[PDB]
Design a binder for this molecule. Structure first.
Ligand SMILES: Nc1ncnc2c1ncn2[C@@H]1O[C@H](CSCC[C@H](N)C(=O)O)[C@@H](O)[C@H]1O
Ligand SMILES: Nc1ncnc2c1ncn2[C@@H]1O[C@H](CSCC[C@H](N)C(=O)O)[C@@H](O)[C@H]1O
Ligand SMILES: [Zn+2]
Ligand SMILES: [Zn+2]
Lengths: 158, 7, 19, 178, 176, 151, 17
């Protein structure tokens, strides 16, 4: 059952621009920031992009990696990935943190899945938005370091 | 490939 | 880079997978 | 046998769940009937609007077997319907003021009264509230629960015997009795 | 400026520091707002922040004599709208009105008290749910929250509402 | 519909929304449906002072001697409800040979009540009437096949 | 009040003056 998720989603779609702005991250590169105070359990922004198949995502990642082009992919389900590297929305910029103030969740409408970024606590204007990426844990030569800067940081994004 | 995830 | 207001389905090309 | 959405008496573009109690619309108005019909007495069933995005709509109610499946409920003389948009009642494609509209999350109730000799009646319910008599002295014949949808909305039908808002002002039998 | 009252409340309810969020505790218990109205058309909003399994709310309007140790709608002094099944309550009588509401819904509360045709109207996510009561008892009415168990709601008195009604005029409760 | 007890309590909180007084086409004042009433709904209670028969006989003679109109309803064989002084709007309900309401005594531990319930669906503005049950004045209920006589 | 009242008879309720 959808509960209030349809209304929340549609309301978020008409005012997400008032919730966020883009700026230099204290964590890495660019990030998204709260343009205003955001209450707990608020739908903030949708992760938007081009829906691609798994093997497409594997080919594209190697091409993206060929160009030092970062990770802008978000898995939608077992068979599909949202690629936001070349086209999509500003949610691609939300950084990872060990002390996250947002969560990422799939909402299942009949017209398709949507990746929604929601508040897990009250967020104050000017705070950087961040969620747990939940990257697949991997090997050392792979291993990627974390600079979320929070106290009790796990030190790795894996 | 490496992707952000919900779970 | 082009923004999108909604998700769009990727239209794969014939050689999408070729090396 | 158990009362379900009909296996074959239905527009092919409609997407019906495997328990045959939920249905999704597809483009222009198209209809599915229930597997059982009623010909005498007072009967009742419920429908929940699971999802109704903007620019989708439903017309719900009762149909005779000759109700056109590639048309909205209420299109011809063989059906009477209630439209999510503005709560309009439809019969022979004429829409009359009846109730206020319904939408996603609403649980709609459908009462038909076909009394023997010794007037027939169609009444709609919105989340347990009696919306009044919509049609009186209807054509004699057998009537089936019927669902017609416009675009990709989703509804679920409950024939009984346990309803969310069982009427207390009217005596009835659940459609599940068939 | 309009807040949840800090003494016109059942003591077991947990009021936030801002006095705009309340968490329930066990059996139904009520908090009223600090300001009430006798005349005019007024509006406020409540958002259901959290509604765990088996918790419930009854929300609406209460006169000062409404019992704080009872659900809203218990007696003649209040009118409420129950999360479970959208039932309307007044004098402990439940009547079918609308569908249910729950977590993440944004509820709107309208009252009209003309000088002398009164009505109480509830909204769910900007959708008018219909006149719930009419020709109500004359008196001073306060925005009122009653909660069953540990559910969490947040009240917004205005003037900026998430779903400002488009079908009738009102003043925000915040104008008091 | 539920317990007669809960129907009664429900009715007591909203009976003012059910009825209104107006000049009757039958006689004097009457009571009318302020809205649509589905069949077998409790509409209003006939309230008053419950008195035994020999008290009612003496009270009735006293009222007539003072030219005040008497309003009474016989509950059972030993008790009457005197609404002449302590009655409500239910005392103005007129008699009809084709009634749309019935008057019933609902036994309760608290005490007995006279409840006027609808016998069919009643529509807003229609006059409310029950059959005064009889044992001689002309009847002017206006119904087809009126029984012509009262009291 | 809106309820029935039960009359309380006097010892002499039925007597003649
Ligand atoms: N907590 C963190 N520590 C180190 N790098 C991070 C990080 N969170 C995000 N990043 C970087 O940002 C990428 C995710 S896309 C996030 C936006 C990025 N900061 C930008 O300016 O484009 C990751 O591939 C990683 O390189
Ligand atoms: N059907 C009927 N025809 C003629 N008189 C009637 C009547 N029903 C009631 N009445 C009159 O009303 C009395 C009952 S009290 C009912 C209210 C009354 N019409 C009034 O205005 O006071 C009866 O004694 C009789 O005098
Ligand atoms: Zn970290
Ligand atoms: Zn007569």
């Amino acid at each position: 059952p959808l509960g209030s998720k349809s209304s929340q989603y549609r309301k978020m779609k008409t005012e997400w621009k008032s919730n966020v702005y883009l700026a230099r991250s204290r964590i890495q590169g660019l990030g998204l920031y709260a343009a205003r105070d955001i209450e707990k359990h608020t739908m903030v922004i949708e992760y938007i992009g081009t829906i691609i198949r798994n093997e497409v995502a594997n080919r594209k990642e190697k091409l993206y990696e060929s160009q030092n082009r970062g990770v802008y992919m978000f898995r939608m389900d077992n068979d599909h990935v949202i690629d936001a590297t070349l086209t999509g929305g500003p949610a691609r910029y939300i950084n990872h943190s060990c002390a996250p103030n947002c969560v990422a969740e799939v909402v299942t409408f009949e017209r398709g899945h949507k990746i929604i970024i929601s508040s897990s606590r009250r967020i104050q204007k000017g705070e950087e938005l961040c969620y747990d990426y939940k990257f697949d844990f991997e090997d050392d030569q792979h291993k990627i370091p974390c600079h979320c800067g929070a106290v009790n940081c796990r030190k790795w994004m894996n | 490939a490496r992707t952000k995830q919900t779970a | 880079f082009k923004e999108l207001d909604e998700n769009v389905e990727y239209e794969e090309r014939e050689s999408e997978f070729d090396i | 046998s158990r009362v379900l959405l009909a296996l074959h008496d239905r527009a092919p573009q409609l997407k019906i769940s495997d328990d045959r109690l939920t249905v999704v619309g597809e483009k222009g108005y198209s209809m599915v009937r229930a597997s059982h019909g009623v010909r005498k007495g007072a009967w009742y069933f419920e429908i929940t609007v699971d999802e109704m995005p903007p620019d989708t709509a439903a017309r719900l109610g009762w149909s005779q077997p000759l109700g056109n499946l590639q048309a909205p409920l209420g299109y011809d003389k063989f059906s009477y319907s209630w439209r999510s948009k503005k709560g309009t009642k439809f019969h022979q494609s004429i829409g009359k003021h009846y109730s206020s509209g319904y939408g996603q999350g609403d649980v709609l109730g459908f009462y038909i009264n076909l009394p023997e000799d010794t007037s027939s009646e169609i009444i709609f319910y919105k989340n347990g509230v009696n919306q009044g008599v919509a049609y009186k002295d209807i054509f004699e014949g057998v009537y089936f629960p019927a669902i017609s949808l416009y675009k990709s909305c989703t509804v679920s039908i409950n024939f009984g015997p346990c309803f969310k808002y069982p009427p207390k002002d009217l005596t009835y039998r659940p459609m599940s009795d068939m």
